[PDB]
Structures are given as structure tokens and as C-alpha cells.
Amino acid sequence: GTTTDGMDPGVVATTSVVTTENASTSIATAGIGGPPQQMDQQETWRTNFYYNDVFTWSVADAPGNILYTVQHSPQNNPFTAVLSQMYAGWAGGMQFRFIVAGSGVFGGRLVAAVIPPGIEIGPGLEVRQFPHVVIDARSLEPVTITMPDLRPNMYHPTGNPGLVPTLVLSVYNNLINPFGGSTSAIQVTVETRPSEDFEFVMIRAPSSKTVDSISPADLLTTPVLTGVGTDNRWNGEIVGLQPVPGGFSTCNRHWNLNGSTYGWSSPRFAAIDHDRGNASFPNVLELWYASAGSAADNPISQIAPDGFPDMSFVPFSGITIPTAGWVGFGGIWNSSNGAPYVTTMQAYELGFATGVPSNPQPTTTTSGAQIVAKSIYGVANGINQTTAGLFVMASGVISTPNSSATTYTPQPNRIVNAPGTPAAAPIGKNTPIMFASVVRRTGDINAEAGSTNGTQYGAGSQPLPVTIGLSLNNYSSALMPGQFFVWQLNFASGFMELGLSVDGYFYAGTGASATLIDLSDLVDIRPVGPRPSTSTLVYNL
Amino acid sequence: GTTTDGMDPGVVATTSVVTTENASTSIATAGIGGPPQQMDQQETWRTNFYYNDVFTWSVADAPGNILYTVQHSPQNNPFTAVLSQMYAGWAGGMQFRFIVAGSGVFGGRLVAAVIPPGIEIGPGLEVRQFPHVVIDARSLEPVTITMPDLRPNMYHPTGNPGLVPTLVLSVYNNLINPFGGSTSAIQVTVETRPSEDFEFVMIRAPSSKTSPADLLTTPVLTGVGTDNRWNGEIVGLQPVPGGFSTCNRHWNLNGSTYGWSSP
Amino acid sequence: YTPQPNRIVNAPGTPAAAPIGKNTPIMFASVVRRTGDINAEAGSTNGTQYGAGSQPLPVTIGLSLNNYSSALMPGQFFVWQLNFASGFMELGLSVDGYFYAGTGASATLIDLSDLVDIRPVGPRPSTSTLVYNL
Amino acid sequence: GTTTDGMDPGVVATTSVVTTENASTSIATAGIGGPPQQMDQQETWRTNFYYNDVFTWSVADAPGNILYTVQHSPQNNPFTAVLSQMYAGWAGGMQFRFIVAGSGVFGGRLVAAVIPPGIEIGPGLEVRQFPHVVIDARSLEPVTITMPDLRPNMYHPTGNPGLVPTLVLSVYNNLINPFGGSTSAIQVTVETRPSEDFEFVMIRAPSSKTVDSISPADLLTTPVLTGVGTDNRWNGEIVGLQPVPGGFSTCNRHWNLNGSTYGWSSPRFAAIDHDRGNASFPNVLELWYASAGSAADNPISQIAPDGFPDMSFVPFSGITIPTAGWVGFGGIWNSSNGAPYVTTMQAYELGFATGVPSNPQPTTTTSGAQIVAKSIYGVANGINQTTAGLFVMASGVISTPNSSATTYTPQPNRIVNAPGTPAAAPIGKNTPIMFASVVRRTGDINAEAGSTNGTQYGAGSQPLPVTIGLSLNNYSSALMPGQFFVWQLNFASGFMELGLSVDGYFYAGTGASATLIDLSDLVDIRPVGPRPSTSTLVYNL
Helix, strand or coil, X not given: CXXXXXXXXXXEECCCCCCHHHHHHHHHHHHHHCCCECCCCCCHHHHCCEEEEEEEEECCCCCCCEEEEEECCHHHCXXXXXXXXXXEEEECCEEXXXXXXXXXXXXXXXXXXXXXXXXXXXXXXXXXXXXXXXXXXXXXXXXXXXXXXXXXXXXXXXXXXXXXXXXXEEEEEEEECCCCCCXXXXXXXXXXXECCCCEEEEECCCCCCECXXXXXXCCCCHHHHHCCCEECCCCCEEEEEEECCXXXXXXXXXXXXXXXXXXXXXXXXXXXXXXXXXXXXXXXXXXXXXXXXXXXXXXXXCCCCCCCCCEXXXXXXXXXXXXXXXXXXXXXXXXXXXXXXXXXCEEEEEEEECCCCCCCCXXXXXXXXXXXXXXXXXXXXXXXXCCCEEEECCCCEEECCCCCCCCCEXXXXXXXXXXXXXXXXXECCEEEEEEEEECCECCCXXXXXXXXXXXXXXXXXCEHXXXXXXXXXXXCCCCCCCEEEEEEEECCCCEEEEEECCCCCEEECCCCCCCCEECCCCCEEEEEEEEECCCCCCECC | CCCCCCCCCCEECCCCCCCHHHHHHHHHHHHHHCCCECCCCCCHHHHCCEEEEEEEXXXXXXXXXXXXXXXXXXXXXXXXXXXXXXXXXXXXXXXXXXXXXXCCCCEEEEEEEEECCCECCCCCCCHHHCCEEEEECCCCCCEEEEECCCCCCCCEECCCCCXXXXXXXXXXXXXXXXXXXXXXXXXXXXXXXXXXCCEEEEECCCCCCCCCCCCCCHHHHHCCCEECCCCCEEEEEEECCCCECCCCCCECCCCCECCCCCC | CECCCCCCCCCCCCCCECCECCEEEEEEEEECCCCCCCCCCCCCCCCCCEXXXXXXXXXXXXXXHCCCCCCCCCCEEEEEEEECCCCEEEEEEXXXXXXXXXXXXXXXXXXXXXXXXXXXXXXXXXXXXXXXCC | CCEEECCCCCEEXXXXXXXXXXXXXXXXXXXXXXXXXXXXXXXXXXXCCEEEEEEEEECCCCXXXXXXXXXXXXHHCHHHXXXXXXXEEEECCEXXXXXXXXXXXXXXXXXXXXXXXXXXXXXXXXXXXXXXXXXXXXXXXCEEEEECCCCCCXXXXXXXCCCCCEEEEEXXXXXXXXXXXXXXXXXXXXXXXXXXXCEEEEECCCCCCCCCXXXXXXXXXXXXXXXXXXXXXXXXXXXXXXXXXXXXXCCCCCECCCCCECCXXXXXXXXXXXXXXXXXXXCECCXXXXXXXXXXXXXXXXXXXXXXXXXXXXXXXXXXXXXXXXXXXXXXXXXXXXXXXHHHCEEEEEEEECCCCCCCCECCECCCCEEEEEECCCXXXXXXXXXXXXXXXXXXXXXXXXXXXXXXXXXXXXXXXXXXXXXXXXXXXXXXXXXXXXXXXXXXXXXXXXXXXXXXXXXXXXXXXXXXXXXXXXXXXXXXXXEEXXXXXXXXXXXXXXXXXXXXXXXXXXXXCCCCEECCCCCEEEEEEEEECCCCCCECC
């Protein structure tokens, strides 16, 4: 009993949803796709159990609290997911093996049940009023539960499988430690193998693509966060994760799971170039400005030229240097022939401001606003032109008046967004986060990391490869409204979960904290899949 | 071999998607719509092949180029299209007969395969990595390919069938004319015939509605219609190589306008 | 023919029509009066004056009344066939509402006097050259 | 005979290498890995033939010329390659089916043979002095030839399989057309399926990595060249391929297939920053310079700071504007505290030059050279300092004196390389090529594409994702010295082949032409695999 082999299911527990009629009907209806494939019952990939997930069980969990959910899918087994790349459909059930690492002195019970399709999974689900099985905290041998395929279709297409059942495990009775003390939690391991009636149909070419994508599993791979990927605002290597308990919004260079964007930029960093604008200087500070909604040459949107930052404008004059402003190197060029005014090359600051023919005032709404660029240093010689063009670089820096570092920018109050942009708000104990990278500052252009003058961090909403992938492929059917697609980040000490919504914002289970999370100890990233958005993500750091 | 009657299929080429299990399951599951209709196996409209389409095969077609492709539908047969006006559902397969009008001196081969539902059809689709059949340009007798009804639903409603399989014919090897000259293309004729398991269900009214074809009719351009800027009878078409733009009294295919005038 | 492309005034956000391979956007040309000679209509010795429009009026009315937002995918043309006495030609319509013909880089006016009938064809890829057998 | 089904092998032709002893020995020795997996003989993926490649046969091919080669590998079948992701070893042979699209009036014969391991494949191989089979050009039914597994190991590991045999098809007699005329070529199609003794052993986790990589197949994927990937010198979207008949060399931001580089930059674009240098100006042009071999803060190499361009310096003075020079926006900063001299912000030109305390002279050797930056426009006010720092952006532009466009730069004579850098030279009809992107020019900063003033193209040696992949993973065993890893680029009209060597240079079969190849009509990229470097690549455009 103390030793378990890979082919041992332990105690077999069944519920009222495992019937002969269901199996016979599933097998009969699956025949529309031809004879079943991969039915050799002596293959190693079919006979052994393989790891799926591990979750914890604490004494502070009240009865009815959900500890583990999983949606029926071939992605729940390492070898069925690989085999799914060469077939167009699948059918059948799966077996789930649970091992409880308890002791003989503990108390409490767990309950498991199968949820039929069409029922929402959340805090309002009463698992104990379904056909169910009860497992004690003192169980020694593993317990296996079978999830049948309850489907309204003849078979599940690889692209869009349709409606599938769900398996939920919740607390039946509180875990109790008679001694008390600091030991108040145990762990449960889940393992899976396909049932005897699982099958594939309709072999297909591996290079062909399904109308609808399986799932955005490949968007967030380890190189994206281990030092190769960069953020979508400052184009710098991501080095940390910054929680945002207040909440924020972002639309510039930001895609959702429907192949649409609310900004004006493309998933790249290319020189900002506009042709028609008003330039004047009434060592002098050149001031160029234009009206929003006039970028007729930008096909994505007309709000601003492609690449224009979505930060507010910080007023400044004379010797005073603005703090936390977006600065790019460039200048003015003659809109008549395209030639550049060589005497205006300098590091300008760009932003969105309203009513600035004379009075600079910051704004965060693109409706009825203006785009303003103003040099922070004296140019060689000023130019007065009614119509002139602006040419700036897209990879900017942060303006600071001294060598000291400031808080991460842009702050949530500095972000400028188009109307209709959805917002990210905390959900229970799940908080939206931003990706933090290291950026240069004008006060000290030599401090990068570990300097005595402090470290400066810029923030972005999505990684650049993730944005490119969301802008290329379609993921409008992989996730339902109200669920998070969860990946697992594995560090040297513990691990954490990272969720992605349908709007494109990332969430972590950091609660109300705001301390930056370091990614130096990251080892690898493992996808998990769809989970309810009201389930707290694991943060074991 | 030089004479073919209306009931001869010719050479029956089989693909792995054609199985007895599929036909049996389709017949069993189609019963949800009631007893099958138009299922007599001795009717004249079911036993014969009838013309559907024709396409051209040139020596300039590179391998992989698609020459013919149709989605599974009752519209692929002249007589099932007529009967589909009074029925609301259908299920079953269909056979396709191909006759190549070549000669004994030509070279080149074609490839045909059936694409399962849920897979995008386009230039990136590699037909030759699916189970397929190779047909030579010197074929004297007709070759028949059967498309089975692979579907995740119980039946196909006429309003919206859903996911359906697709038949694709593409170039396997280039057409070769040893003599060269001006003769550099041949024709291929396609005829169809329903399978033994095809059926209709759920009779409906002929005048029941489930494209912008009627927008541009002959009177619009033969002397009755007028332009949207000067209100004068259209008499010519002027190309604009440079390109232009227009929003006043101009509507797109989404029921919206960017101008300020009414039609 | 007027208005020339540089004379057209448009609101911001209006999409433009550009050549696609060998497919060129076209305008519909009609006969209009001029103040200098209000008697010349067609075949006059003083020349013929042509005005230009973007869409026919019945087509505009139909597009403004009914919904066609699902009949065509982005990147395809709905093609009709115009049959003349000698040969035929293809005419494509996009989602933005502009008409295209396979006239290449030519700019000569096409006469509609010999038109006999119009036959619809349907959706086709926008990168496929339209047949101009005239 | 005119119709062939997917399971029909046609005429079965055998040679002296297909023996009972070989099969029995292979089956017996494969048992060290346990029972064989995936042996179900009725599976669709085993019973059908699937497409491998298509090649042409011309009347101008002399006898003994090689038309088709393939190396024994599970990558030669679409479904065995997928299944190889979950197993640690394989053994067995493969069947190859050939179809000739000939006619009854043609003449000529082909010859096929199996080459045992350890024999070089090239123009010096006499195929007709091996056991072989002869195929006529008038063959109607397909002909199938079996390649047995002739291996010195018990089984082939997935990572490093070892020595394997090769299949070669060459001309036996010239193809003849009795009518003559313009018809002088026919086509041959090759298809594969596994033999009855093919097997897998030792199932493994799909997420585990093999010590040595299978093959660099995923380095060059369609998004890299369809509009997402960028070059490694100008960071611009690749839009064309430029042949280089003369030959060139490149080491800055360029990796080989051994995980090593000869340059000084990392696979990224980050601001160029150096601390110690001599700045002087004896509207004035500021001139900063330093000695090479003094970048102690750069861990990759000490030749130059990371990101410094590898182009030569073009002398200029007064009003004259240098042509085809690398220009970046930036300036001088105080090395004492890191503060920047705000009056020196301008667009400088950077380069390598020798002996420039007074006389500018270009150079192309980093040994005993100097790095020189000089502003091309007058700064607000000059600064004289014995020690000062330089801060420039890494995404530069091309300097031109007017609005006209020039040839693609840098030219092969302008590239600066470290000693020991291997060169790329034409091999028969295979010519090294560069990746061409669109870059801005100072004379006209508004012309991008299709402008009346001309188009300016910058050139790079490798795509950025390819460089990153080569710098992360190990490919030192996938390719032997003297072979090219070939991908296929499929356009609307025809296709082309692209080869990659061990040094990291790309080759195309464009011969002695130098016209730019457009990538607008590209549809998809299909890997092919290892091929002899002396075999001409197909260029059917």
C-alpha cells in the first residue's frame, strides 16, 4: 500500500454519470469519422499515469470551497496533446488518479463530482448536491475517478471541440490537526491517463491549420520571459512583474483575443513620422503640435501617427526639466520636399495635451485632444513654419531633472486611451500586473542595474511576441467569457500562476501587495489551461 | 473504352475516408428528421451522372496549383438543387466522375483528395500529404471519386449546413506536350451522382428564405440607371490608374456612409 | 472628365481605392451639360463632356437599404460579367464599395453601347486578374 | 495503370542491400530498447504514401549527374517526425515511391542506388558501379525502392542518430525528344512511407530536451520572412533577398552552428554607450574617438562597445555630407557623473577608422584601429574634454547628401570584420545572399516605398530570430561539413530553395545574377533538410 506503480489505479470510484448507455452511444456515434485510430491497448503512452497538477489543502478552507477544476480536453495529457497534431477529431473519456499526502492523525474529507456541460463553474456551485464520491484525508492508496464524454456532438473537432463536461474537487469537511501548531496544510497530486474508449479520427497533414486555433499555449514560452522577449512600450528586456492593485487601462499596441485593437500603433518599433503640423518657438525650445484625428496616412487608426506614445504631456519651460516624460531624439523636417532642418535635431518630449496653442495642460482622452512635441534642450536655431513635419525615434527614454531614480512610469493616471477601451480591475484576490523593464534616464545615462544612484523601470501591458501572436492568429473560441488561461512559472523555490483574460490583460494572485517580482530565478514555464477567473492563483513565493 | 453510358462510373478510386461505418452511422443518425424522402433507388434522377462543371488544365500550372474545389452541398448536382427548394435538411455522400479529354501523346498527372471538416482551404493547404489518388492525363475511361458525409451534427439544415468536407483537385505533375506549338491546354468535365445514402428530410414551403446579385442588373447599365454625382445616364466606364476616393453619396457593404448626402 | 481625383473632397477616415495587381478602380461616366455650349449632347463637333461618379444610384440605394455585411469576406471581389457583341469583361465590387476592372494601366474610356446583358459570377479572390476580352 | 491509389506501391524493385540477414539483425539488436512501439499495421499513417519532394529532369543533363539525394531520417515522413517528439530512439527502413510524368515518345533512363554510410556524396560518386535499378522515362506505374537501415549502432538516438545510409538518383541515359522544339524537361515525384520493421523505443516526456538538437528546422518559419522578422544590422522588416556574386564576410551580430561568434554585439538592439574617449572640435562638428580593444565593460568582446556598427568611416568636413554612412542620434555625456552635455545632442556618424587624431582614413580591420564618431551637423556649442562618454542609439539611418537613393549598403568592401572570420564564396552555381530591408535616409526622411525619389535598401547577413535561435540552442551535430540545410520558399508562380551552411551564411541558386528578389508573393516556407553543398538549388522564378 505504501508503494504505487505507474499502472496501478488504486481504488476505482464511479458515479451515476458512468453508464453502459453512454459508452455504447459514444462508440456508435464516433463511427461517423471512420475506424478509430491509436487503439493499441499495450502501448506505453496509454497504460501509464502521467503528472497533471498539484494543489494544496489548508485547514482554513471552509466547506464548499473549490480546490481544483479541469475542463475535459486532450490537452490534459502530455501524449494525447502531441497526437492531436495529426488528427481532426477525438472522442472518449479520461481517467484521473488522485494521491493524498496525508497522515493518520489528520481529519477532514474531500468531495469530487462531474459537472455536465452548460453549467457555470464558480463560487455558487454546490458540489454536494451532485452525484459524488467522498475521500478521506487519511487515504493511503490512490483513488481513480473517470470523466465520461458527455457531448451534444457526434465528435469533437480539433479546432473547436464544443461543449464538454468538467471535473470539480471541493472541501467536504474541514481539515483538522489535533495537535494544532504551525502545520496546517497538505498536498494532493493529480495524474491522468486516457480511458479505454478514447479515440482519434480523420488523420490530417501536420502543416495544415485549423480554422480556429486549439489554444494560445505557445504564446508565452520560456524565452519570452527569461531574457529574450521585450515589452510593448519601451522595447526593453522584461526583468520584473509589477502588480497594480488600483487598476489601469491600455490600448496602444495592445491586442485582445479577438484580433482587434483600440490603439493606433502596430506590433513593431519604427520611427514616428508626421508631415503636417504647426512648429514655432515664440538655445531656444522648439515646439511642434498638431490636432488629433488627423493622421490620414495611418491605416490602423487616425488618432495619432503610428508609434506615438500614449503618455500625457508634462508642461515645462525655461531651465526646469519635466519629470517622467517620454523623450525621443529627432526634429523637424521640411514637409515641402522631405528635407530635414539640420539645426533642430535634439531630444524632444512627446505627449498628449489639450488646448496648447499657449497653455500646456495634460490630458488622458484622445477625443478632442492635441499631440505635442517640445524640445527639452536648446536647439541650434529655431524655425517658424505654419506647416512642417516631425520625425522622431520610437525607442524613447524617461526625462528626469537629476540623477535620482523615480517610481515606475507611466503611472495609471498618465496612460492615455481611446474611448471604448475596456479596463482591468481586481477580481477577488487576482490583480492585474504590468511587465517591468530597465530603461535609460536623461539625468544619468550610465546607470543600468545595481548602480548606487538607483534603478529606473518602465512598464508595459503585454510582451511583444505575445502581442504579435495575438495580432496574427485567431483565439476567439479558445476561451469563454469569465475564464483565465493560466500558465505556471517555476522558480527555484516554489512556483506561481499567471492568468490571461479575453481582453488581453495578465493577472497574478498577489492580493493587495505592490512589490516588484523578480524573474531572475525563473527556470521554465508550463501551460495549465482554462480555469475560472474567480479561483485564486497560486503564489508560493 | 471509347463509349460511356450514363450509368457507368468507370474506374472506382477509393480513399481511406470511405468506410462502411461512416455510411451506417450517417443513415442511423439522419432519422432524427423523420422518414427519409426521395430515397427510391430506381429513380432516373439518382442512377445517372449529370453535368456539373468544366475547367482547364494548362502547361503553365505549377505543381500544387488548385484547378477545382467544391464544398459538399446539394448545389453540386443539377437535380438535387431543384429538390432542395422544398426541403429543409439533407445528409449523405456524393460521387464525382471525371473525364479527361486528352490524347496518348500528352504527359502529366493530377491528384485528388478529400479534406476533413474544420480545416482551412487555401494556398497553404498541402493536398499531397492527405490520402489521395493520382490520375494520369492519358486516362481513356472515366474516374469516379466519392465524397462521404463527415459531419459532427446529425444532419445538415439547408439554411446553414455547418461543418462539411471539401474536395480538392490540384496539379501533381506538369502537363507536357512533346510537339509544343499553340496547343497547350486540355479540358476536364465533371459530372455528379448522389450516393446510396443521400436523403432529404423536413419538407418546407418553396418560397422560404434561409448575396448582392440583384444590385447590378442589366437596366442599370443599359440606359436606365444614373450616376450618384451628376444624375445622368451612365454611358461609359473610365479607368483611374492613379486611384481616388469618394464619400459623398457612397455606401459600403456594411450599411454605413462617410458623406453627408442621402441617395 | 471632372471631377479629377485631386478635386474630390472627402471626410477624414474615408478609405481609398488603389490598384491591386492588374485590377484598377473605375468610375461611371455620363454626359453632362456645360455653360459654354448648352446644346452639345453627343456626337457634336465641339466635343463631348463627361461627368464621373463612383457608384450607380440604384446600387447606392440598395446598399443603403439592405445588409450585405456577411456575403463577402475581406479580400474578395464580387464579380459580374458584362457581355458585349465581341467578347466579354468582368467587373468586381469590393467591401468598401468601389468597382474594379482588369484594364491594367490603360485610361481610355470604355463604351457601353454594345452591352447586351449582365450575368453575376460571385465571390472571387481580389488578386485574380479580371478578364478583359475587348 | 492510369490511376494509382495511396496504398499501391506499383512495381517493387530490390537491390543487393535488402537481405534477410540485415532485417533479422536489425530486429534483434533493436530489442535493447524494449518492445517496439507504434507497430499497428492497419493505422492510416503507416499504410499510405505521402508527398516528399518533386524534382525536374532536363535533356541537357549528362549521364552521371545527380538529380535527387535524401538522407535516411524520420524527418522524411510527415507523421514519423511528429511521433519522434515523444520517443528517444528509432530503427528500421523506409519505402520510397517514384512516379515519372513522362510520355510514350520520350527516351532516356534513370538509375537509383543506396549508398552505405561513410561515403561522401558529390560529383565524384559513380552511381552506376553500385548495385542499382534502371527506370525508363516511359514508365507508367510507380516504382518503389526500399532503403534498409545500415547502421553501426544498436539503435538511432533521437538527438544524434549517427551514421545512416543515403539514396541517390542520377541520370543513366540522356532524355531525348524526337520532335525537338521547346519541350525539353519532365518532372518526377517522390513519396514515402515507413517499412514494416520501422519502430520507436523508450517513450519520453515531450517537454524534455535532447542534449543535441534534432535539426534547425524551426529557425526559419514563415512569419520570419513574411513581414514579422527583421534583419540583424538595421532592425528593419526584411522585404527582399540580394545576391552577392562577389562574396562578403560578416561577424558583428552573426552566429554559426556551433554557438560561437566573432563579433562584439549581442542579438539585440540597445543603446551604444561608452565611457572613456577623447572629444574635441578643433555650429561646429563635434568629434569623439577612442582606441579599439579598450571595451573592458563588454563581456562578449573588447573590440568595441556592444551595438557599435561594423561599417567603415567616411571622411567629411565643412558643408560636404558623407555618402552611405551610419548615422545615429545621440551625443556626449560627462564620464565623471553620467550627466549629459545637453548642447551636443545631434545626429553623429559612427565608424571604424585608423590614425584619426588628424587624418580620417577608412579601414576594415579591427586590429590596431580606432572607433570614430563625428557629428554631421553643427552642434549648439562644442565641448573640449580629454575624457568623455558617448551615448548613441543603435537603430541608425543612412547619410546621403541629397534626396536621391543609392545602392544597397554596406557594400562588401565597407564591412569591418575581426581576424579569423570565415568568408562566404560562391560554390558552383550557389551564391551567398543578404537580406534587404527598407531604411530611412537623411536627405529624404519621408520616402518609404514606391516613392518617386527611389527606394533605399539596407542589408544584413542573418534574420534576428535566426540569430537568437543559433545563439540559444546547439546545432553542432545536425549538419556535417560540406552540406547545406535547405528550406523551400513557395511563391504564387513556382518555388525556390534556400540553403544554410555551418558558418551561418545563406545561399541561393541565382548563379551570377545580382537582381533583388521580391518576397511579396511568398506564401509559406517548407523545410527540406540536409543536402550536398555542390548540388544546385532550384530557382524556378
